Specification:
The structure is cut from a larger assembly and holds seven protein chains of seven kinds.
Chain A (H helix, E strand, L loop, with lengths): L18 E3 L6 E3 L4 E8 L5 H7 L10 E8 L1 H6 L20
Antiparallel strand pairs in A: 1-2, 3-4
Chain C lengths: L2 H18 L2
Chain E lengths: L3 H10 L14 E3 L1 H9 L8 E3 L14
Parallel strand pairs in E: 1-2
Chain F binds a RNA duplex (37 and 243 nucleotides) through helix 2, helix 5 and helix 6.
PDB class: ribosome
Keywords: 40S, Nsp1, betacoronaviruses, cryo-EM, ribosome
Entry title: Bat MERSr-CoV NeoCoV Nsp1 bound to the Human 40S Ribosomal subunit-State2
Chain lengths: 99, 88, 22, 82, 65, 149, 213
RNA sequence: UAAAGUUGCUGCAGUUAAAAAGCUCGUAGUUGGAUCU
RNA sequence: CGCAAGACGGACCAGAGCGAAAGCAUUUGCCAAGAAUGUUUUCAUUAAUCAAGAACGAAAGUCGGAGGUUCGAAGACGAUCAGAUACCGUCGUAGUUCCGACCAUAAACGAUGCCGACCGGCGAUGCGGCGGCGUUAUUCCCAUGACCCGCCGGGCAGCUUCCGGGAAACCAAAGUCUUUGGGUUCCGGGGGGAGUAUGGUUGCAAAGCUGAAACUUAAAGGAAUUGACGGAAGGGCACCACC
């Protein structure tokens, strides 16, 4: 029986969606089916920030960030706990977690 | 381009943006218009200039996206090309 | 048994039969 | 709902409708007498003209065809008929 | 906890009426559209009504996304 | 919907209820006939003639001023084309698609569209042959089509 | 009303409505409340036709009066904005109040402690009073509701179009309904103003009572 | 033979139980808008 | 720091668009199309669906020609393992790329034929058109762009609903069905044997289309429920758990 009305993807109004490679396993997954994360993280950790800022030759240099796009397949996204199973009623919910 | 007296005299070779800036500038509910021109200055220096721009959300806009239509993108790219050629 | 492997076995059987009846 | 009078629609509701889904279909277009200060005669222009109309007594553009209603050149007085 | 004594004591407590009604005052603001609605009802000649001006713009929808 | 497309468009002319010459229109029936004759001599099809009569002369509908349709007027005067306007335009489009296809032979979409256009051409030709507008021997070919254009 | 000039709307009533913001609806409009709205404002707010408000209030008062046992009318309020108004209405008119949470099964479960069989049901907000309304569909219970522009009209038999969000408007509507019901009953006259005033039916924030003490 | 509306014209089914052709075009076939006392 | 080759067009990229489907994403130009909207233009029934027949049809595969970066059936090793003819790793042939000729198959899926009518609501979004406060750019006026608020028409969808339906899951279609008839094509008849044998046809092949019977069997199966289980996730408890 059908688990999802959208079949776990966003392929409405077309026939084919180009595939992408999973960042974890390199599996081929449709771009609209893959789970997409955009991580904008400081290039230095919150531990190394103190030493790096103390040793900087500038004043208020503001460290650059790191913008990484991750395209997990369903298996890898479930294993990495990026998404998890939900109840049959709660599956329909589409608002992102508040974080 | 030359070295004299323990002194290296550099010349302009190119320009670029840091990866952080370009990565930050690409957001997900707007279009990125990109143009490029191969243009020679009045002293034989033939450069290739790349221009990038992004459509701007209005301050009273309620629509999530700010997409320009394809003809609008083409007009913007032609304007980019002509302005860069004029300025170079 | 997976249905596609049953199909593959049937196709190999058909090829062996084609070799049988030339 | 459940009691809408389909024989006597209000004029605002009927003007809101598509021109074919009205009780009796009527066009949204019209004809205008247009007059230019540099002309001594009027002409009749369709509101949705598909051609470039020229002044009868001059050589100036009168209206430019567009997707829908034509663009009447500024300075020309236009009045709807009927 | 619910006994009749509490009910009567609370109805005594809520037996509070202000000196001046919070409703009717000297001047009440009314928008032009509700002014037209009142003039349709033949109550548009009331002098307690001050015709305020409507919102300058049309920004009442929260941004989507 | 559309004959050869999945579209279900509704856009079309919505005629007014009245079948009378409009008040603003001072042109007499013979004047409209003369204007139609001049436009046809200029080499314009009934669709184009009606368009420029509506757009510049205030003639909302020639049938309601003259009592006759434009194509019938042209036939009565005798300056109507041999083959009908819609069939001629379909044949012209098919010729253009075929001329494109000879220099672009990998355009499978062009081949599909040419098949659709030729099906429309054959349907219109069959209709006109039943109505005796076209001779019963008239057939559409892949070589003589450009001659008819 | 019925074009009876004794039942026509008064200048004082119009001023009370305009002061309480009764005519001011919401930014959303239920398709079944279209007939009660005059026009939308320049800021997306829907204006409620107060003539239709008075007409529906008089119809609701007529429905309430045609129950010769006043306790057979149940007045319900789950929101705090209408609990005091409902209690005041029940005290003045003789109805039975349910102020607070409505226990499901009150109308349907014969065994329950709060089981009752009213003959008519009046609620402050069909959205916030959806539980009694649904139970009204189980025991042949006619329903009166104070409905905003976006109120859902399912199981609502007499819908009074009014602002039911503000405390002032809710209190004023309940006070006006009690006044109309009493006037139709015979007690209190239609000539001089009622000795009670809307501010008794209002709701005050606990900070307001602290300020008043 | 009825039961069998499990041969369905009356009168069956074809998302997931068996099942809509991968997709259009297309001749025969079937079907075909208003209107004339 | 350059140079060469081949492949591919990230981020922008969306339950967005276009195409009959397969499918389609760097710029610019040329070429022929196309839907929708607008239309007081033209014809005047020219239409719907369709045996036969025809075009197109992912990937893989097959012939020739070019190329040959990456990846990579087969294969060679290295590991892991009781064993691994696999999963993992290093290489690596065909292939992957383009041209021409074949092949015509996919969970080719919305597992849902097409055309037409009627039947609730709501907010979005794409294209076109219409109307309107107000903001912004083209230094200032209108036009037009970008917004804002509505309306109309087709479109991809979504939410909601005791429309109605259904075995239910669910579906505004899978509704308007014992109150059973709008038109038409394809197609199913318990499970296996079996999409097999055989004949025919198509193909260079691989195979494609059409396609049984003997025999066997009381069930296969659909949806949902309660348990039990999980080398599924999340919580909670305990010195017969730990710190």
């Amino acid at each position: 029986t059908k688990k999802r009305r959208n079949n776990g993807r966003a392929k409405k109004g077309r026939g084919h969606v180009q595939p992408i490679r999973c960042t974890n396993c390199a599996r081929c997954v449709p771009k609209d089916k893959a789970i997409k994360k955009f991580v904008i993280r400081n290039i230095v950790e919150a531990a190394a920030v103190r030493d790096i800022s103390e040793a900087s030759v500038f004043d208020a240099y503001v460290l650059p960030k790191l913008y990484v796009k991750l395209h997990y397949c369903v298996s890898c996204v479930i294993h990495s706990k990026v998404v998890r199973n939900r109840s049959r009623e709660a599956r329909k919910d589409r608002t992102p977690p508040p974080r | 381009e030359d070295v004299q007296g323990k002194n290296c005299l550099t010349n302009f070779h190119g320009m670029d943006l840091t990866r952080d800036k370009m990565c930050s500038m690409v957001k997900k509910w707007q279009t990125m218009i990109e143009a490029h021109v191969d243009v020679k200055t009045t002293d034989g220096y033939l450069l290739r200039l790349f221009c990038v721009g992004f459509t701007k959300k209005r301050n009273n806009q309620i629509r999530k996206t700010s997409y320009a239509q394809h003809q609008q993108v083409r007009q913007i790219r032609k304007k980019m090309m002509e302005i860069m050629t004029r300025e170079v | 048994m997976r249905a596609k492997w049953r199909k593959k076995r049937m196709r190999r059987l058909k090829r062996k039969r084609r070799k049988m009846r030339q | 709902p459940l009691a809408k009078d389909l024989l006597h629609p209000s004029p605002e509701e009927e003007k809101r409708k598509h021109k074919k889904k009205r009780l009796v279909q009527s066009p949204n277009s019209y004809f205008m007498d247009v007059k230019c200060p540099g002309c001594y005669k009027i002409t009749t222009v369709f509101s949705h003209a598909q051609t470039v109309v020229l002044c009868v007594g001059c050589s100036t553009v009168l209206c430019q065809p567009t997707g829908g209603k034509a663009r009447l050149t500024e300075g020309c007085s236009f009045r709807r008929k009927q | 906890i619910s006994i009749k004594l509490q009910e009567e004591e609370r109805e005594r407590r809520d037996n509070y009426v202000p000196e001046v009604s919070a409703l009717d005052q000297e001047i009440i603001e009314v928008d032009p559209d509700t002014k037209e609605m009142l003039k349709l009802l033949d109550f548009g000649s009331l002098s307690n009504l001050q015709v305020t001006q409507p919102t300058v713009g049309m920004n009442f929808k929260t941004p989507r996304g | 919907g559309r004959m050869h497309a999945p579209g279900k468009g509704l856009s079309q002319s919505a005629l007014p209820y009245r079948r009378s010459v409009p008040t603003w229109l001072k042109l007499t029936s013979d004047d409209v006939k003369e204007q139609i004759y001049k436009l046809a001599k200029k080499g314009l099809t009934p669709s184009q003639i009606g368009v420029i009569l509506r757009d510049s002369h205030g003639v909302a509908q020639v049938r309601f001023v003259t009592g006759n349709k434009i194509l019938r007027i042209l036939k009565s005067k005798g300056l109507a084309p041999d083959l009908p306007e819609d069939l001629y335009h379909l044949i012209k489009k098919a010729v253009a698609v075929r001329k494109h296809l000879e220099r672009n032979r990998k355009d499978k979409d062009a081949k599909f569209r040419l098949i659709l256009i030729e099906s429309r051409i054959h349907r219109l030709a069959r209709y006109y042959k039943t109505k005796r507008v076209l001779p019963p021997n008239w057939k559409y070919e892949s070589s003589t089509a450009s001659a008819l254009v | 009303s019925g074009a009876l000039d004794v039942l026509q709307m008064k200048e004082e009533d119009v001023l009370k409505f305009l002061a309480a913001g009764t005519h001011l609806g919401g930014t959303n409009l239920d398709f079944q409340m279209e007939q009660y709205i005059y026009k939308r404002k320049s800021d997306g707010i829907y204006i409620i036709n107060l003539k239709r408000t008075w007409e529906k209030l008089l119809l609701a008062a007529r429905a309430i009066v045609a129950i010769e046992n006043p306790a057979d009318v149940s007045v319900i309020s789950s929101r705090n904005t209408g609990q005091r108004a409902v209690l005041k209405f029940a005290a003045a008119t003789g109805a039975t109040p349910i102020a607070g949470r409505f226990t499901p099964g009150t109308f349907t479960n014969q065994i329950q402690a709060a089981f009752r069989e009213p003959r008519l049901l009046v609620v402050t907000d069909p959205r916030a009073d959806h539980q009694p309304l649904t139970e009204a569909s189980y025991v042949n219970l006619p329903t009166i509701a104070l409905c905003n522009t976006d109120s859902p009209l399912r199981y609502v038999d007499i819908a009074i179009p009014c602002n039911n969000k503000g405390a002032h408007s809710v209190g004023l509507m309940w006070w006006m309904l009690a006044r109309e019901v009493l006037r139709m009953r015979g007690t209190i006259s239609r000539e001089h103003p009622w000795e009670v005033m809307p501010d008794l039916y209002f709701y005050r924030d606990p900070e307001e009572i602290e300020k008043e003490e």
